[PDB]
RNA sequence: GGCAGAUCUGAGCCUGGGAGCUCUCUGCC
């Protein structure tokens, strides 16, 4: 899974 | 025991730009 944080996408798990 | 939302990060930090450390509020079966 995917999250937007502070100018960018990060991935955490799927 | 399992899937997913918040968002100008809802938010601390780094042995950072990493399927990283972390941290809060909630749903569904």
Between CA A14 and CA A3 the distance in angstroms is 11
Experimental determination technique:
NMR
Cα–Cα distance for residue pair A8/A14, rounded to 1 Å = 17
Report whether A13 contacts A1 (CB < 8 A).
yes
Contact A9, A1 (CB under 8 A): no
Q: Nearest residue (Cα to C1') for B9? A: A5
Instruction: Write the DSSP assignment of A1-14 as a string of letters.
Output: -EEEETTEEEE---
Spatial distance from the CA of A3 to the C1' of B22 (Å)? 15
Question: Do A11 and A1 touch, CB atoms closer than 8 A?
Answer: yes
Per this entry, what is the length of chain A?
14
Give yes or no for CB of A12 within 7 Å of strand B.
Answer: yes
In Å, how far from its chain's centre is CA A1?
7
Q: Is A7 left (phi over 0), alpha (psi -120 to 50) or beta?
A: left
Contacts of A9 (CB under 8 A, 6+ apart): A2, A3
């Amino acid at each position: 899974r995917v999250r937007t944080r502070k100018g960018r996408r990060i991935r955490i798990x799927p």
